[PDB]
């Protein structure tokens, strides 16, 4: 409260940590159905269904122009990425399995690098 500080964490590296946390998520081979925006144009009921799309290239963008305030909005976008995936695919398909598969490896490097 108003003049009790609570001891915070050195937050300097974060976006450096979170620069080569997204570099490794965009050349994990099951990355290619997150790497650019889905075509809202020409994907059938994307638009509608997914209120808030997210991909890899969009969060790289908001990385590199001071678009995240802290780490926790990074990680949102990342989960989003992968919430997008499994309301939008069967767990038993190609995507499916690979939004799993990259929602894994995301969660063990953000544990092991900020935890
Ligand atoms: O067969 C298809 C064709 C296009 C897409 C998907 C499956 N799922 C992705 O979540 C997003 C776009």
Same mark, same amino acid.
């Given at each position: 409260?108003?003049?009790? #500080? =609570? @001891?915070?964490?050195?937050?300097?590296?974060?976006?450096? !940590?979170? %620069?080569?946390?997204?570099?490794?998520? *965009? &050349?994990?081979?099951?990355?290619?159905?997150?790497?650019?925006?889905?075509?809202?144009?020409?994907?059938?009921?994307?638009?509608?269904?997914? #209120? =808030? @799309?997210?991909?890899?290239?969009?969060?790289?963008?908001? !990385?590199? %122009?001071?678009?995240?305030?802290?780490? *926790? &909005?990074?990680?949102?976008?990342?989960?989003?990425?992968?919430?997008?995936?499994?309301?939008?695919?069967?767990?038993?398909?190609?995507?499916?399995?690979?939004?799993?598969?990259?929602?894994?490896?995301?969660?063990?490097?953000?544990?092991?690098?900020?935890?």
């Amino acid at each position: 409260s108003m003049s009790v #500080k =609570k @001891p915070k964490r050195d937050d300097s590296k974060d976006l450096a !940590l979170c %620069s080569m946390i997204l570099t490794e998520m *965009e &050349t994990h081979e099951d990355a290619w159905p997150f790497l650019l925006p889905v075509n809202l144009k020409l994907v059938p009921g994307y638009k509608k269904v997914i #209120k =808030k @799309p997210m991909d890899f290239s969009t969060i790289r963008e908001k !990385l590199s %122009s001071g678009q995240y305030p802290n780490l *926790e &909005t990074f990680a949102l976008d990342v989960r989003l990425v992968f919430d997008n995936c499994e309301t939008f695919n069967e767990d038993d398909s190609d995507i499916g399995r690979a939004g799993h598969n990259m929602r894994k490896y995301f969660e063990k490097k953000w544990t092991d690098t900020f935890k």
